[PDB]
Amino acid sequence: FNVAHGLAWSYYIGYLRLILPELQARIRTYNQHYNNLLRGAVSQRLYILLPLDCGVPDNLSMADPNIRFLDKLPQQTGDRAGIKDRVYSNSIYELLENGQRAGTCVLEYATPLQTLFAMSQYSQAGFSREDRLEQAKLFCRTLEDILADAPESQNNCRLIAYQEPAFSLSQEVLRHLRQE
Amino acid sequence: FNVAHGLAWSYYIGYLRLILPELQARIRTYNQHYNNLLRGAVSQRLYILLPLDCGVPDNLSMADPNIRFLDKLPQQTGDRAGIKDRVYSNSIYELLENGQRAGTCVLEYATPLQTLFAMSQYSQAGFSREDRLEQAKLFCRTLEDILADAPESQNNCRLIAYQEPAFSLSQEVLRHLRQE
Ligand SMILES: Nc1ncnc2c1ncn2[C@@H]1O[C@@H]2COP(=O)(O)O[C@H]3[C@@H](F)[C@H](n4cnc5c(N)ncnc54)O[C@@H]3COP(=O)(O)O[C@H]2[C@H]1F
Numbered sequence A, B: 001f002n003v004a005h006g007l008a009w010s011y012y013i014g015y016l017r018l019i020l021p022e023l024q025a026r027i028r029t030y031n032q033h034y035n036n037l038l039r040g041a042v043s044q045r046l047y048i049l050l051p052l053d054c055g056v057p058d059n060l061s062m063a064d065p066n067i068r069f070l071d072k073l074p075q076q077t078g079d080r081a082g083i084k085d086r087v088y089s090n091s092i093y094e095l096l097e098n099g100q101r102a103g104t105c106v107l108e109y110a111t112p113l114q115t116l117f118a119m120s121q122y123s124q125a126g127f128s129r130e131d132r133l134e135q136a137k138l139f140c141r142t143l144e145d146i147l148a149d150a151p152e153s154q155n156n157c158r159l160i161a162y163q164e165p166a167f168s169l170s171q172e173v174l175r176h177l178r179q180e
Helices: A003-034 A111-119 A130-148 A169-178 B003-034 B111-119 B130-148 B169-178
Strands: A046-051 A067-072 A076-080 A083-088 A091-097 A100-109 A157-162 B046-051 B067-072 B076-080 B083-088 B091-097 B100-109 B157-162
Touching: A003 A046, A003 A076, A003 A083, A003 A111, A003 A130, A003 A157, A003 B003, A003 B111, A046 A130, A046 A169, A067 A169, A067 B083, A083 B067, A091 A169, A100 A111, A100 A169, A111 A130, A111 B003, A130 A157, A157 A169, B003 B046, B003 B076, B003 B083, B003 B111, B003 B130, B003 B157, B046 B130, B046 B169, B067 B169, B091 B169, B100 B111, B100 B169, B111 B130, B130 B157, B157 B169
Parallel strands: A046 A100, A046 A157, B046 B100, B046 B157
Antiparallel strands: A067 A091, A076 A083, A091 A100, B067 B091, B076 B083, B091 B100
16 A cells, blocks of 8 residues: 555665765765776766666666676765664666767666565565556655655756666666766 | 555565575674684574664664674675675674673664654654554564564574663563573
């Protein structure tokens, strides 16, 4: 019912609000050695993939060969809930276009969507298949509303919502990436 | 309403099911250098604190001075949702009794409870104060039910549910720890 509402606020309170204030510094750190006049710098914002109907794989290259892992940012650490130095790591990806690097950004799925999809594997979860696609849409809706009243976070990330038709994901990212 | 139901399944699918199969190996690794005849070994199971009415701090020593951080386990890594080598770290704590180490175990709060509590800071979250204590209880209830049908995970962790009265948390852990 409201499972998407809780996962969205959990995603915001327990992740975005923690890493986004520190993201630009980590990106600036990586760009200091990586950036030169032979290629564009890593973009500044966090780009979040929000597939409405996808299994959400772990390797982005399997969703699109033009999305290839490039490097990790410096890790971020912080004590949380009894775990010393809980680790927040993020990966930089290159976007290929005609066999050439056309963009570079920190890119990842909104992991909770992967969790919604996986709840269909458990009868006790009570998550049907028709309900799954609706909760996915509600997850993106509440998340967008949250960032609307949180400009500090809205400026440090970009949501990329889409639906796998039965389309190049690298292009959709490059589209958002070219408006920055 | 059912916010606790989603956070419980998220906690299971996206964490316990991932680290618990590998926990004993990480503990065995740490015990190889740490364990000798002058002190007990680190316990085998993951002990999870489930406060029903607590702000859930990040430093366990602030909840009880007899709970002191000792060391981290070896990290666990795994690609997830586009993040290469997402990091899972856990902390070992000593339980003091009469100024002497009486136990050693991997110990942490159930982080989602900390998230429930924090949702009261946002009007758009719609989480009142009366609803907070009820969702906390429902989180522990669904989690217990999940582990009931998951003996592979139930044997590698122990839930410690309690309620801060208006009581020694180190003792409650030592009680569970002495039945192992
Ligand atoms: N390494 C871990 N150490 C301790 N506990 C963990 C860990 N992993 C999972 N758990 C437990 O399992 C719940 C559900 O995890 P999830 O499905 O990945 O959903 C996450 C995820 F989408 C995003 N997020 C947060 N940190 C990162 C990160 N480092 N990378 C990417 N993404 C993140 O925010 C959501 C809520 O995070 P929260 O913490 O409040 O709840 C979690 C937590 F209780």
